[PDB]
């Protein structure tokens, strides 16, 4: 997809942020969005097309693929990016609002609170998405999925496409998110000092 | 699709709008257009291709898919975006017209009325599209669709692609639209004060 | 497709036009080109691929699809856009020519005539395309097409893809074109006064 | 394909050209490149995929499609555009060369000759491509192609995809090219006066 | 593919080059890259998909297609473009280096040598790629390919997609490369004088 | 994929780097990213679709393709590019930080250390990816892959798509990486002097 607008706003943010914050935005762009667009999206391109179940029951493949993957990982990661970005948008909006107010007439006591809260919310969203991914899928995609969802007769064997590659990228994204967390915590500590 | 032109005009609007209004435009861009383009459009990509009916009647799949999905959700959402955007275009056009008039020779009594009416119309279109979606599809896509449309013999079983993921995104868009409504109402209240 | 160049010229026109004219160009961009690119083109994407005829005669599907859809609606609409845009290009060219002439050495008596004629021609092309669409396809796409074109033996039953959605968008475009006509007529009246 | 670079150069040309010449470049952009990119290329998208021959001889479809369409119309039109554009590039290069020469130290006697010759060559290339198209394909694509090319046993019947639509666009392009010719001739006459 | 970056650098080169050199870069852009992107890449799009062998041996089509086309022509041409472009990059880098050196503190004796060597290397790479193409594929793609590569039993008949069109474009590219050579030689002669 | 953002940052780096460093960035752009996007990605486009195994066991093709290619080469190369680029981002960030610090109030003793370490890390990542590729795949892709992974009965024969072309590009990328190493070493030596 096209991320140009979000990139515009976030680049604008870069100016109004801590050094750790600029590192965080660089990470967001390079190791999440770029990889999604150029590496991961191709990996999941044939997720359902090459999902194959050992049966001749009509509709069994559509229901078994939907059971194994209620939301695809790539879409989960899209949502994750958007939600961890939103607070930064809030903060830069507050900043530009104060700027226009001063013109009509940096991290002051008024902004500081908003900035800290935005770091806090980035952290909360990151942790939430990581936990949700863990419970939904674990962190490994196994090649065999056994499904007993109607209309499938008894339990059928279905086989996932590219399970090892998908696992590699799952773990890669997990690590990127953990790095984001570390950065957020160090930024809170730096402000504290 | 390419939304660049609409984005140009709406970015122009951002200047001539209330703080709540700028939040609303940010929402429009990030949580509706971006998601459509990068997440939802892939979800619905194989909507008809992976729609499968248990029959060997020719033409039964084309007529049963058309019965279940008279308009696809993604196209409904496109139309929604365009129609909720139009009033903002009207208002910014009025603004630039007054600007050129003054040059030849902010929210004044002349504009205020137009602005309030444009908020009102955004609200009406949002509510209308939400209601229309509810009656057309409810808010859950079930995996099994039973169809009795000619040429299908008797009632046939057809199976939808990615029903759970489509449901997730349906609800997501519903929530985004509700947030838009709340923003519009708070903007009317703010003007009232 | 890529409409960037036409958009450049037409944006240039926006300056040299009446307020109604700027509304007309806004409509052209938002409700015709954007929709084509992001909504309609996907609807017609599988027009022939999912066109299915009840026969085992080779070549019957290629000849029956060509009979039902001699020109696809999307291409008809492309041509329509281009032809209703051309006169505006003529007028802005005349304007820039007079500008360069004056530099070497707004709606004057010389331009006024050209402007009125360009409105007239926009109107004629719009009416012509609407009428042509009516005679070629009516304004509803029915699900069943019966074809007796060689090599098909006797009359065969063919089934169209996405007939209801295609009908929705057909009517939508009809309405957009009618709005364009109303705008053109009001612009002629405004000039008359 | 991406025509951006050629568009850059030709837009640069627009300044250094006659009024008829600017009309010609506008035509080139709007009625040839835009249509190719947004209308015609989709029409020919499934040219070979939906080419079907009544046989069960392996390789018969690959050899019969190659016999009927040695070069596809869309690629012929691409080449046409490039070759009718080249002379304009030559002329603008000569112009910028004289400009730099004068700086180191409009249609003069030196340029006039080059300009006239470039018009002449545009005309020659246009006529050549039109004639070549006529002999290669006539100007109508018939639905049935009968092929006797090895490995096909005896004469086989093959059926073309979208013959009527392809015919419509063939004639459209023919008309565009004829308009280009008329423009070139009027430009020569205008210079003559 | 996206050639934007290379285009940036080469456009930068245009300033620092002979008139013949600017012609050469214009050729590179218009008659090699543009054609690849808009004409040739579609021709080779279904190269393997529509490659068909008369056999029911599994794996025979994958091994026979790989034998006939060890590297596809389009990728060969990509590499060719990149390698004939590299020396121009070297030269413009040398130029900007001397510029920065002079600022800290045209074709001089220092640059002249580098320029001549870069022309020489362009020529060598062009000749090498032309010769390599000749030995790898001749200059005509025949419709029938006979393959005896394991697992195929005995010799099997395989049929190429679009052989005549591919031949047309092969010869076209050969001619473009020969024109490049002529330009390089004339540039060396011009410098010599 | 879209590499625009990374390209922005790296172009920014070009200014703050040694001449050898600018050569290295030019290589990165032209011989790694451009080739990936325009040549290699098409080569691997049908990697799994045209992967064929001699069996009628369901799921055997999905598990045998995943065994032969746990990560596809193209994605490996993407990751490689990103990781060899990261240190340059670190260094330019340090540079801009010192710039802003000086404004509030080239290769100095403070920067020199960071620069040398960033060269060192580029080298380490390059060597690591080269070694990892060697152990994962060797440097030749053979046409036949024999797989005994459940559910396949006994050992089955699977046939790779485009093995010779993939081998050519594998070796090409190996050579590009080796050139990068040589450049890094010469840059360390140059600094040492
Ligand atoms: C279904 C439990 O079925 P199972 O365990 O047998 O399915 C096994 C997993 N299989 C369904 C994917 C096969 O129910 C679930 O697991 C629901 C898990 C919920 C995952 C998402 C949690 C919330 C994410 C919040 C993100 C936003 C925060 C800011
Ligand atoms: C800053 C961010 C950094 C985070 C980086 C995360 C990288 C994670 C790479 C590997 C994770 C999954 C490995 C796996 O899942 O392997 C299991 C599989 C045997 O599983 P089984 O079926 O026997 O049970 O292993 C096999 O045998 C088949 C061979 C698999 C080798 C895959 C090597 C991938 C190397 C990627 C390097 C990326 C560098 C950035
Ligand atoms: C058909 C009632 O058939 P059913 O209930 O048996 O079909 C069940 C639903 N299934 C047809 C999708 C299967 O008729 C309908 O429901 C028509 C429902 C109308 C939905 C759109 C309402 C207007 C939207 C206005 C948006 C613009 C405002 C600014
Ligand atoms: C500001 C905007 C925020 C709005 C966010 C809206 C998010 C809505 C997420 C979930 C809604 C549908 C859940 C569902 O439809 O589940 C039904 C299905 C059992 O249905 P059944 O066949 O047994 O009857 O559940 C299963 O068992 C299978 C497991 C399904 C787990 C799906 C978890 C998705 C988590 C998305 C998180 C997004 C964060 C932004
Ligand atoms: C064929 C009459 O056969 P039918 O009625 O049995 O076919 C029924 C319609 N079916 C052929 C689509 C199935 O002949 C026709 O209808 C020809 C209708 C002509 C449609 C276009 C008229 C001119 C458009 C001008 C646009 C430019 C103006 C500026
Ligand atoms: C400024 C521009 C505004 C112009 C807007 C034009 C909108 C036109 C929308 C509906 C037109 C076609 C409806 C139809 O063709 O329905 C026939 C079909 C029964 O036909 P039958 O087979 O029984 O005979 O209806 C059914 O039962 C199935 C349910 C069909 C419901 C479709 C609702 C679409 C709502 C779109 C809203 C767009 C808002 C902008
Ligand atoms: C083959 C005559 O076979 P046929 O008539 O039986 O094939 C009937 C036509 N079918 C081969 C397409 C089926 O030979 C020909 O017709 C060759 C015709 C040549 C067409 C191109 C002429 C030169 C274009 C120059 C453009 C550049 C100028 C600046
Ligand atoms: C400035 C540039 C302007 C140039 C415009 C060129 C437009 C050419 C349009 C029509 C040409 C081919 C018509 C045709 O080839 O028709 C033959 C076919 C019967 O052939 P048959 O199998 O009976 O023998 O006609 C039928 O019956 C089926 C119905 C066919 C109706 C097609 C109407 C297309 C209207 C396009 C309007 C474009 C406006 C710009
Ligand atoms: C700095 C540049 C270094 C260039 C180094 C090039 C080294 C080429 C080695 C080619 C070995 C072929 C051995 C051979 O022959 O085993 C194949 C059999 O025998 C045959 O089929 C006859 C094959 C004949 C191949 C002739 C290749 C000529 C390459 C000239 C390159 C000139 C560059 C300036
Ligand atoms: C295989 C000889 O088998 P064959 O003749 O029976 O195959 C007939 C040709 N078929 C393999 C394509 C079918 O061996 C060859 O021909 C190898 C030919 C080498 C082509 C490339 C030469 C070097 C390109 C250098 C470019 C870079 C310079 C700057
Ligand atoms: C500045 C750069 C300029 C370079 C231009 C290079 C143009 C090369 C065009 C034709 C070359 C291949 C012709 C061919 O390979 O024909 C063989 C085939 C009979 O072969 P066979 O199976 O009987 O043995 O001919 C047939 O019968 C079937 C008819 C084939 C006609 C193809 C006409 C193409 C015209 C392209 C014009 C391009 C203008 C720029
Ligand atoms: C599996 C050994 O099975 P095999 O040899 O029988 O499989 C033969 C190879 N086949 C699995 C591809 C078929 O285990 C392996 O080879 C794992 C090899 C690990 C490759 C990646 C190493 C680390 C990359 C680090 C990059 C980041 C540095 C900055
Ligand atoms: C600065 C960066 C420069 C690095 C350039 C690296 C270029 C590597 C090119 C060739 C490497 C693989 C050759 C091969 O893998 O060949 C094996 C195959 C016989 O293998 P077999 O099945 O008999 O055992 O050879 C055959 O017979 C079939 C014919 C294969 C000819 C392929 C020629 C490709 C020429 C590419 C030129 C690129 C120029 C930049």
Numbering used by the authors:
A (entry chain F), B (entry chain A), C (entry chain B), D (entry chain C), E (entry chain D), F (entry chain E): 2 to 106, 149 to 236
Copy the relevant paper text.
The connexins are a family of transmembrane proteins (21 isoforms in human) that form intercellular channels for cell-to-cell communication. These intercellular channels establish a ~1.4 nm pore that couples the cytoplasms of neighboring cells and enable direct passage of electrical and small-molecule signals (such as ions, second messengers, hormones, and metabolites)3 and therapeutic agents. Intercellular channels are constructed by a dodecameric (12-mer) assembly, with six subunits assembled into “hemi-channels” that dock together through extracellular domains, resulting in a continuous ~1.4 nm pore for intercellular permeation. Here we present an electron cryo-microscopy (CryoEM) structure of native connexin-46/50 (Cx46/50) intercellular channels stabilized in a dual lipid nanodisc system at 1.9 Å resolution—providing a near-atomic level of detail for this class of membrane channels.
